[PDB]
Structure formats: structure tokens, C-alpha cells
Amino acid sequence: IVEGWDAEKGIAPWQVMLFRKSPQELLCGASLISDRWVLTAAHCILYPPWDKNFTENDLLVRIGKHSRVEKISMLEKIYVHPRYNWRENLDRDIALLKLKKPVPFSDYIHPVCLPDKQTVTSLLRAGYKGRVTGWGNLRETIQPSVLQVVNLPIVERPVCKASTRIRITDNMFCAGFKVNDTKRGDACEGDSGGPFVMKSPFNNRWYQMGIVSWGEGCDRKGKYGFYTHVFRLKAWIQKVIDQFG
Amino acid sequence: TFFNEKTFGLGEADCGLRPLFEKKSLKDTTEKELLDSYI
Numbered sequence: 566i567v568e569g570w571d572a573e574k575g576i577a578p579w580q581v582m583l584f585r586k587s588p589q590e591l592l593c594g595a596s597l598i599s600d601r602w603v604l605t606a607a608h609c610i611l612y613p614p615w616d617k618n619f620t621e622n623d624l625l626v627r628i629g630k631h632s633r634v635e636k637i638s639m640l641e642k643i644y645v646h647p648r649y650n651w652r653e654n655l656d657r658d659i660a661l662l663k664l665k666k667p668v669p670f671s672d673y674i675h676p677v678c679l680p681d682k683q684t685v686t687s688l689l690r691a692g693y694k695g696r697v698t699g700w701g702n703l704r705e706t707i708q709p710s711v712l713q714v715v716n717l718p719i720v721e722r723p724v725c726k727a728s729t730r731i732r733i734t735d736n737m738f739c740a741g742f743k744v745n746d747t748k749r750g751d752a753c754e755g756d757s758g759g760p761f762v763m764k765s766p767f768n769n770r771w772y773q774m775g776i777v778s779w780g781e782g783c784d785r786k787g788k789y790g791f792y793t794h795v796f797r798l799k800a801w802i803q804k805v806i807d808q809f810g
Numbered sequence: 811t812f813f814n815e816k817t818f819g820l821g822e823a824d825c826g827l828r829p830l831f832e833k834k835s836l837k838d839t840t841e842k843e844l845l846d847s848y849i
């Protein structure tokens with residue numbers, strides 16, 4: 566997280582850390598959507614280019630961590646979206662992780678809500694701000710001691726497409742401040758897989774609208790972070806959970 | 811709700827309501843900035 570700030574205790578009880586089982590190493594962020602299912606980006610699991618293709622035995626998750634009570638969980642299984650093809654664009658960058666055993670909830674471990682049609686329709690709109698949290702590099706190039714948080718404005722789709730050469734699909738959206746905004750901020754390396762959440766002004770619940778997917782450089786003005794449109798892929802989530810839950 | 815507790819596990823019904831915030835009528839230090847952008 567670049568140009569962010571320290572998290573308050575319990576401000577994002579759904580935050581999850583994806584670790585490489587010793588050889589220990591923080592690989593990505595993720596989120597708790599229930600006491601047995603964890604959401605993250607597909608590229609955190611499978612990305613040959615960066616030499617990435619882990620199995621349930623290669624990874625580990627830490628939940629309820631505020632500073633660098635909290636639990637460490639093993640993975641039962643990993644499910645990468647079927648139409649995800651790293652050999653291309655990063656479209657449908659999404660993956661589900663099933664915990665070996667359920668994680669009991671607490672003041673620092675609580676699931677985030679998944680969006681419904683009406684929530685997205687009214688909230689995922691240009692200018693509206695969402696929040697990203699993570700233990701990614703504080704500097705584009707170096708890591709934080711306390712979970713970092715940052716609020717980012719959703720960017721107009723035409724503006725997103727014009728900011729990059731990469732084809733932007735309907736399964737993505739971008740966020741970040743404009744070159745002229747006095748404010749800066751963005752997710753970086755290590756924040757990938759992390760949640761982009763919005764708080765509903767209708768029922769005061771926090772919903773996860775996106776998953777940090779990719780960005781050209783960290784906090785490069787004129788450029789924006791891209792996220793996986795979680796709602797558009799909710800059908801698949803439903804399928805996996807019903808089938809392998 | 812939208813999912814089945816049997817395969818989804820526990821948490822859906824109470825999802826997104828933070829124990830140390832919403833649960834006790836407390837707001838974090840920057841959520842207002844999010845609310846403002848929605849208006």
C-alpha cells in the first residue's frame with residue numbers, strides 16, 4: 566500500500582495474508598467471506614511468468630493480524646477460475662481457497678459481504694470511493710509493520726481504458742486518483758489478491774467489490790490500479806462453494 | 811441467504827458488520843470519506 570496509513574485494530578477483520586509455507590514468504594492478500602472460504606486473485610496462485618503455481622501444500626494463511634489471538638490455517642483445496650488464462654490479459658483474476666478447518670470468528674476475524682445486483686448498481690460508480698488494505702510494499706520499491714489502508718475513487722471506464730494499452734474487460738474496473746488530484750495512493754506488490762471494499766450507506770455492511778489484480782507501477786500518476794469485478798463472477802463462486810463446500 | 815450455510819460455512823448472515831465498529835456503534839477514522847463520495 567502506497568500513500569496509505571496504519572489500520573486501526575479490527576478495521577478490516579476480513580483481511581487475510583497468503584504465505585508461502587516455509588520457505589516462508591508473504592505472497593499476497595486475500596479476504597474472508599465465511600469461516601471456511603477465502604477469496605483471492607488467480608495470479609497469486611498461478612502465474613508461470615513470475616514462476617508461480619502453488620498447490621494446497623505450498624501455501625498458508627494468517628488471519629486476524631493487525632501488527633507484524635491470530636490464527637494460521639492450512640488449505641484444504643485451491644480453485645482457480647476455469648476461464649483464467651495468464652497467457653493473455655489477467656481476465657477473471659479470481660481464486661477460492663478452502664480452509665482445512667473452519668476459523669472461529671473474533672473481534673479481528675469476521676467475514677466481508679459479497680455484493681448483490683442492487684449494491685453494485687448503486688455503488689460501483691465513477692467517483693465513489695472504496696477501500697483497499699494490505700501488507701504490500703509501502704514503497705513501489707520496504708514492507709509495513711502494521712496493516713495499511715487507503716481509500717480510492719472508482720474511475721470512469723473510458724478513462725480506465727485510455728490510461729493503458731492493455732485490453733480492459735467487463736470483469737475489471739480501475740480505481741485511483743487523477744493526475745490533478747492532490748491525493749495519491751495505490752496498492753502495490755504484495756497487496757495483490759487483497760480486497761477492495763465499500764461500506765453500504767443503506768445497511769451499513771461492508772461489501773467486497775474487487776480483488777487487487779494488477780497495476781503498471783505503484784502509484785504512477787496518470788495510471789490506475791485494476792481490480793477483479795467480484796460481482797460479475799459471483800455465479801462461479803456460487804458453483805464452487807455448492808460443489809466443493 | 812444467497813449461499814448455503816452447509817457448504818458456505820458460517821458468517822453470511824452477519825457478514826460485513828465489524829465487531830469493534832458497527833457491532834458497538836463505532837465508526838473508523840476514514841469511513842466518512844467513503845460516505846461523502848456516495849453523495
Ligand SMILES: *[C@@H]1O[C@H](CO)[C@@H](OC2O[C@H](CO)[C@@H](O)[C@H](O)[C@H]2NC(C)=O)[C@H](O)[C@H]1NC(C)=O
Pocket residue numbers: 613618
Ligand atoms: C502447475 O502445476 C501442476 C501440478 O504439477 C501442473 O500440472 C499437470 O501437469 C502434469 C504433467 O507432468 C499432469 O500429469 C497433471 O495431471 C497436470 N495437472 C492436474 C491438475 O491434473 C501444471 O502443468 C503446472 N503449470 C504449468 C503452466 O506448467
Ligand SMILES: *[C@@H]1O[C@H](CO)[C@@H](O)[C@H](O)[C@H]1NC(C)=O
Pocket residue numbers: 743745746747
Ligand atoms: C481536476 O481535479 C478536480 C479536483 O481537484 C476535479 O473536480 C476535476 O474534475 C479534475 N479534472 C477533470 C478534467 O475532470
